[PDB]
Amino acid sequence: GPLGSMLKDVLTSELAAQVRDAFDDDRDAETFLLRLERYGEDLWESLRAVYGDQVRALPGRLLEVMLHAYHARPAELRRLDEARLLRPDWLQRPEMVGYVAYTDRFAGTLKGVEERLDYLEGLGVKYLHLMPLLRPREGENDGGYAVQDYRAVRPDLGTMDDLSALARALRGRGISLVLDLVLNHVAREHAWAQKARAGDPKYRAYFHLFPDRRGPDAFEATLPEIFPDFAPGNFSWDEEIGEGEGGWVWTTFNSYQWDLNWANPDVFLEFVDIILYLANRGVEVFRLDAIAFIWKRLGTDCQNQPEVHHLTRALRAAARIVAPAVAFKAEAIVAPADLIHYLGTRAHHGKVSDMAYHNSLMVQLWSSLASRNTRLFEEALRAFPPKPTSTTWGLYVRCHDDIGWAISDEDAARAGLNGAAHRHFLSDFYSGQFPGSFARGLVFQYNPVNGDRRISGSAASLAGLEAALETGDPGRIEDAVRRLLLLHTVILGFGGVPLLYMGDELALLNDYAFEDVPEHAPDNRWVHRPQMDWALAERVRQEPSSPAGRVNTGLRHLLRVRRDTPQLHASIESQVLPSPDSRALLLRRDHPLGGMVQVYNFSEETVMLPSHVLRDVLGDHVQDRLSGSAFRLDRPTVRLEGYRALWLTAG
Amino acid sequence: GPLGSMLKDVLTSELAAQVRDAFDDDRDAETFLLRLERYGEDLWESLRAVYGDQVRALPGRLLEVMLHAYHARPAELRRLDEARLLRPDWLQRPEMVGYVAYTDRFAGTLKGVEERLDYLEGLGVKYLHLMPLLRPREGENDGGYAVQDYRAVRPDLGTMDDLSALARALRGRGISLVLDLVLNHVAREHAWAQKARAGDPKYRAYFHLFPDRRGPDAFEATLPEIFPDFAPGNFSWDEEIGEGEGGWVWTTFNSYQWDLNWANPDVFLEFVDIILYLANRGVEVFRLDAIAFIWKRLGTDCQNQPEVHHLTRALRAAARIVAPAVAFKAEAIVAPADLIHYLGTRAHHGKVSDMAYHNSLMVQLWSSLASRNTRLFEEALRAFPPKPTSTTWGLYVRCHDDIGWAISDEDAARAGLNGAAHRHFLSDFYSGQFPGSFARGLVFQYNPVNGDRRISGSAASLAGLEAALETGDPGRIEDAVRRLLLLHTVILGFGGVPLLYMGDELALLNDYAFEDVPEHAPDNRWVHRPQMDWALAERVRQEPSSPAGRVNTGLRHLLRVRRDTPQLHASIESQVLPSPDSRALLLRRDHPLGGMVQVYNFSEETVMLPSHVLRDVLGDHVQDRLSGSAFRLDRPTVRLEGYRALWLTAG
Numbered sequence A, B: 001g002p003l004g005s006m007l008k009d010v011l012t013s014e015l016a017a018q019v020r021d022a023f024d025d026d027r028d029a030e031t032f033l034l035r036l037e038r039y040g041e042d043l044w045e046s047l048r049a050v051y052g053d054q055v056r057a058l059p060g061r062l063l064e065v066m067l068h069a070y071h072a073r074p075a076e077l078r079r080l081d082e083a084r085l086l087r088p089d090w091l092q093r094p095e096m097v098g099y100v101a102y103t104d105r106f107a108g109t110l111k112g113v114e115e116r117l118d119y120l121e122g123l124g125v126k127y128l129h130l131m132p133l134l135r136p137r138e139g140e141n142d143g144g145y146a147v148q149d150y151r152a153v154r155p156d157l158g159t160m161d162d163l164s165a166l167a168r169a170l171r172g173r174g175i176s177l178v179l180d181l182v183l184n185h186v187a188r189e190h191a192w193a194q195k196a197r198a199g200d201p202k203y204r205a206y207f208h209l210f211p212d213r214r215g216p217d218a219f220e221a222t223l224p225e226i227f228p229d230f231a232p233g234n235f236s237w238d239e240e241i242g243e244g245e246g247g248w249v250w251t252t253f254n255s256y257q258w259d260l261n262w263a264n265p266d267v268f269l270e271f272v273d274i275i276l277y278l279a280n281r282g283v284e285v286f287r288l289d290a291i292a293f294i295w296k297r298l299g300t301d302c303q304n305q306p307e308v309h310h311l312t313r314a315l316r317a318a319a320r321i322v323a324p325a326v327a328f329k330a331e332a333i334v335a336p337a338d339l340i341h342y343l344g345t346r347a348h349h350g351k352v353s354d355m356a357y358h359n360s361l362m363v364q365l366w367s368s369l370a371s372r373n374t375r376l377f378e379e380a381l382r383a384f385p386p387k388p389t390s391t392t393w394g395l396y397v398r399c400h401d402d403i404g405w406a407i408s409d410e411d412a413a414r415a416g417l418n419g420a421a422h423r424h425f426l427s428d429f430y431s432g433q434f435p436g437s438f439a440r441g442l443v444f445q446y447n448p449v450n451g452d453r454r455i456s457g458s459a460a461s462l463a464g465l466e467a468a469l470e471t472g473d474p475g476r477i478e479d480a481v482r483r484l485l486l487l488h489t490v491i492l493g494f495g496g497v498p499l500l501y502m503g504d505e506l507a508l509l510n511d512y513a514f515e516d517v518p519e520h521a522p523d524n525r526w527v528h529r530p531q532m533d534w535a536l537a538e539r540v541r542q543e544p545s546s547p548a549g550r551v552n553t554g555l556r557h558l559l560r561v562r563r564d565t566p567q568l569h570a571s572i573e574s575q576v577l578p579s580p581d582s583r584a585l586l587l588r589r590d591h592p593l594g595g596m597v598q599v600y601n602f603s604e605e606t607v608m609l610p611s612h613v614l615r616d617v618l619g620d621h622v623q624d625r626l627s628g629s630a631f632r633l634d635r636p637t638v639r640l641e642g643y644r645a646l647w648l649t650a651g
């Protein structure tokens, strides 16, 4: 009513006054204010939902950080901001293609990356995700995920000026730089944590600290264990915490990764500042690492609490008021219905993030390759609510992490499977324990208490090439190559930005030499984080008939077809077309110029697919975009040899 | 290759040079240039597709017009431009609601409109389409569609400054001004046509002129007749054309409406200038009148030629490089597959328009109300390809025009009907010739050659209220009120901006006094273009139980529910859910927070709908957004009384 109204009035005019006072140039003030009007309600309501009445003390400090970032934003990045506002579906274009790499493994240093831009460009890459490259702690550092200083580049990669000069050279090729925002935890060596241990109460309040086992024991009753092999539980003992003998600190991941206290608005402020600082160095997309973990609540698994989406929305709104070019990409492993909350709900609240990993597509790809059965695939896809049309999936076959078999009991039961049995089969199969498995993966984080296993291994070793090369059997080598190409066809055709993992285009195998690096030995994820093989890159260019060569040639052809296929616009979602044959997966994409049906054989066997399931959708005459040829769907069957993919449209 | 490349290089740099030379302020030059980069390819490629090599001589003249419009654009409309770029889905929000009115009929003058803004705002209107208000020819002028001067307001409505002050007052209420761009033809009294008749060859070349019957006869062989009753055929004889005895001029519509020659790029230039001039007066959306007609080609019906979409795309691109707030709305009556080309194709060419009338929804609403059968409705909807998700339908129950029964033989045959028979039934039914019809419409443009009929009449008279009031039968009055509300429920729920026709909220009946105005008498469309009844508006506010009052109260309730229903976001399209009962129409809308099924009974009879068709989609427990109550879909049937609507979501 009036009392509440009047207070809100005073606040608005205080916000307006601080913005106008900050700009000598009135167009800038007007621009800032329009952005604040567009995103203000998402920013403040989200902040009040997490921080309650405290928020009222927040605007001056937060607007201070944003106003300065705005003044500090280079003219060329202001122009990028306008360009992105003019093309809001930029991530959704079929020409978009991503590439994911550790700087040091790909090209040694940031400047070395600049020397490989013709390689990325020759692949049609337009989105480059470099793995965490901020200064990490010395020694073991979870491959850069234990960050010591967010304002410096790891010194052996270069400097913040190299990062900025790299991003400028990327833009000159139409490539977007994409980096991790490691916002859930910092290295125990970060100055925040050093000061908490020295006793500074401002910085003790950045962490979740406990004098004894009571708090920790009470949380642990409902918490899972993420890295049982590295650091049991979710709390670590540290001698230097407090005045006396130490204390317990929350450490979800490694002991040297201290979870940040997101109930403290100072932490929110620090990360606004980090985001805007990195955006002004040229970062265009932020992958929100471990985003699900940022809110703790007693009695829950401390993942996916509602505050996570409020904080994410506020962080984004603050960022884009300053730098509208910036997009956010959530990585959260959660049930489909919940995953959609990381993107947006197309309701009275604003968008939460621009992209999210489609982890369930990745899991089903490997699951169906192992089982030769696509019914679980169909049911896992069918469980998703639709995303907002303006958001975009990131699709992948592999990445820097092990694979967890995130398959729901509910989807599995709809496909006539027991979930637990199927999940157990997938780890037996991909660790190579199941007889006749083609896969060569390593068990990661076996958990004795519950029997949970994840799998490490590169795409080529999981898909059969490492085993096929050992045998020297030409039929095994052929099938491994075809599986690798089928995997990459699905992520290229599914709708979303396909995120090629460095070297998958060369079919790189497990790197068992990680055991010989003490910093890596305990963590077998490093098996699928190889050095780039540039000699191999040159050999496949000159000799395309080898198995690496055929994966390379094949992937490059698929990339060219993807970019010329308008039906792949990511505003449209693939829908399951129920298959009459359990070896095949049929996906339909409706599009203004005519539908597409993508057809995939997940078996080494020749499937004679009954034609009517396709004819009913596309009519009697179709073209396959992938081979260029025709099919007549008036014949009774369509012949799909092992691992065949088709992208059919009418004609 | 190189020769072609080098020429394109020189052109680009000449375009860049002219833009930089034009701005003293470098941010403005950079902004202009970014927009030119974003839309240039759509602008020039579309122009070359229509005008070929001529286009090469075009940029300087076209950039001249755009550069000046950009300098002339008021700061507040530049801010509107930025606001719209920040909220690109602004037309798609469930809170959007449109209202369509003749200025003089609604409030007398432009300044009179400003006096009724509380009325529009109390309705939640956010989009105001005023009917053609540019200076028309004196006398009969097709209700403003015979424009004499695009740069002046009809003097009895006010001036261009009043139009601008009106638009500013609209923005202050969050209302977008929407006007017709009458781009296909001008009044024979327009200075262009006066000069063509005086002999100026520049202006003769703005029209399609013929010395004798040879050209006209050759075109007529494949042309339909739009207004057989007003002006036969598509050509008129004019004495003053040429030096000798006159000549033939192309006149699709009235004899006094001369079709513009869009094969002349000077005409394209004139309309860029008109659009940007009107955008700088505050116009936000342009309805492209008669857009289908703008390209003539011998041997075709001269509607919907490919050049129409190229010209429309170029016109839009030129407009939004200057004024990104501006959106275009196509009105074309064509097969579904073709209608989608007025919007966009989500391929390598840019968007053609932001909105298009969904004329087939309007036709099916009336068709099913007459037949009590929804199978044709289902099949007509099912024939549409999907629109680009970033475009928006405009939905309506009635408008300023008669109704043509645009029902395809193909949809009709899929519903078990003969198209020609059904179309003949609809004109018998709505002219009130069919025994027991509740409708009181008038035949418009009966065509003796082929028997084509269209229908004039206001919503309330077509839906039965005029006949019900004559009888004084309370059951007939009840049914007419319920039909009116059901009609408006469907357009409010369908997805898109509902375009309320002035006075439909008061249930205005046919105005038979049009026969007493000589300018109107021959054109019975004026029967459904009444004066606003402000006395009635005041009575229903104070006495809501009358039939007008119940339509009013009912519509206002539906408007409030629409705006609080996130599932109505126009990025999502309604899909047919096949109905087991031919009296009912079921539409499904998938949405991130959970699906909706809208259920409509198109019969006066009580339908006991089998529950499983709904339970299968939403589960056992639902809420109806329209009445607030619950249903249990585990019971065997759901009871729908006559004309019941439900908007069900899970719960």
Ligand SMILES: OC[C@H]1O[C@@](O)(CO)[C@@H](O[C@H]2O[C@H](CO)[C@@H](O)[C@H](O)[C@H]2O)[C@@H]1O
Binding pocket: A142, A145, A146, A226, A253, A289, A290, A291, A292, A331, A332, A333, A400, A401
């Ligand atoms: O533990 C969460 C699983 O899901 C993640 O994607 C993030 O939540 C993976 O964690 C991420 O974070 C950890 C800690 O920084 C790092 O080891 C992973 O590489 C990173 O992706 C984690 O496996």
Ligand SMILES: OC[C@H]1O[C@@](O)(CO)[C@@H](O[C@H]2O[C@H](CO)[C@@H](O)[C@H](O)[C@H]2O)[C@@H]1O
Binding pocket: B142, B145, B146, B226, B253, B289, B290, B291, B292, B331, B332, B333, B400, B401
């Ligand atoms: O003749 C075309 C039918 O479709 C239209 O929507 C436009 O093409 C209607 O025409 C429009 O234009 C004529 C001529 O200006 C005018 O009489 C209509 O009111 C207008 O909507 C036409 O009936």
